Amino acid sequence: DRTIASSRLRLLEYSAFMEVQRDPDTYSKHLFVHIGQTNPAFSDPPLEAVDVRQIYDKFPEKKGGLKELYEKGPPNAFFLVKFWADLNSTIGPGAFYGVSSQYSSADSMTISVSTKVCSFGKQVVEKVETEYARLENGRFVYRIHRSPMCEYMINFIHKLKHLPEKYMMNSVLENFTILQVVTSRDSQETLLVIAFVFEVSTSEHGAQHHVYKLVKD
Numbered sequence: 539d540r541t542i543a544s545s546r547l548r549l550l551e552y553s554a555f556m557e558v559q560r561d562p563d564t565y566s567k568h569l570f571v572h573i574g575q576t577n578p579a580f581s582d583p584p585l586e587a588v589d590v591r592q593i594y595d596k597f598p599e600k601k602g603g604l605k606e607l608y609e610k611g612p613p614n615a616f617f618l619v620k621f622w623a624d625l626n627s628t629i630g631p632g633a634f635y636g637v638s639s640q641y642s643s644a645d646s647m648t649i650s651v652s653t654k655v656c657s658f659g660k661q662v663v664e665k666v667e668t669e670y671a672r673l674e675n676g677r678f679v680y681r682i683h684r685s686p687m688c689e690y691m692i693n694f695i696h697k698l699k700h701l702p703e704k705y706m707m708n709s710v711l712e713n714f715t716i717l718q719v720v721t722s723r724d725s726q727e728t729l730l731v732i733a734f735v736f737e738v739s740t741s742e743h744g745a746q747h748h749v750y751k752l753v754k755d
């Protein structure tokens with residue numbers, strides 16, 4: 539619906555950030571990538587389709603693979619989001635690097651989230667998070683607050699930040715991807731798959747993003 543959603547699970551918000559404490563009462567937070575809760579509008583164009591086969595080689599093959607996953611379906615659960623990252627932090631040791639996200643659902647479940655960082659289509663790291671339903675407003679929501687980033691990514695961001703030029707940053711990111719797979723913890727049915735491809739915001743405008751639906755013809 540323009541929404542990143544399946545029939546069983548919707549991603550409401552996604553945020554990868556760093557927080558630093560300026561003084562005992564004051565905190566600063568820079569967001570690298572962001573997806574914000576929007577309400578679908580009736581006038582919103584339908585999402586563009588990207589053939590799932592063109593990105594097979596960006597994420598790992600075979601088991602746990604997008605091909606195998608897409609083969610398992612449901613296909614209306616597979617999304618691709620392109621991220622324009624904000625690497626301009628006006629913000630040292632002790633900063634917190636986290637990811638916060640919310641999902642929603644008509645059904646109450648125990649979700650397990652799998653996130654695979656990928657370099658040149660090879661998995662560098664998997665993080666697995668379990669999150670629990672809470673009843674809000676005609677739906678259940680799942681809230682992941684300040685899930686810490688792992689070192690691989692802290693080092694990646696820093697070193698990427700350290701490159702002199704935004705064009706070089708984008709070249710590295712051309713072969714950096716993240717695959718998120720959300721299952722129902724017990725049954726392992728697929729609820730939501732998002733593939734994450736990245737680019738540096740050359741604008742210096744704040745971070746942006748764009749959603750596509752993955753199809754298979």
Ligand SMILES: CCC(=O)N1CCc2ccc(-c3ccc(C(F)(F)F)cc3)cc2C1
Nearest residue numbers: 554570623637653655663665687688691695
């Ligand atoms: C293994 C799990 C883990 O650590 N994760 C998963 C969730 C997630 C999503 C995006 C980013 C990210 C941050 C900054 C840039 C930028 F450097 F390009 F700006 C690019 C990507 C980092 C993370 C942290």
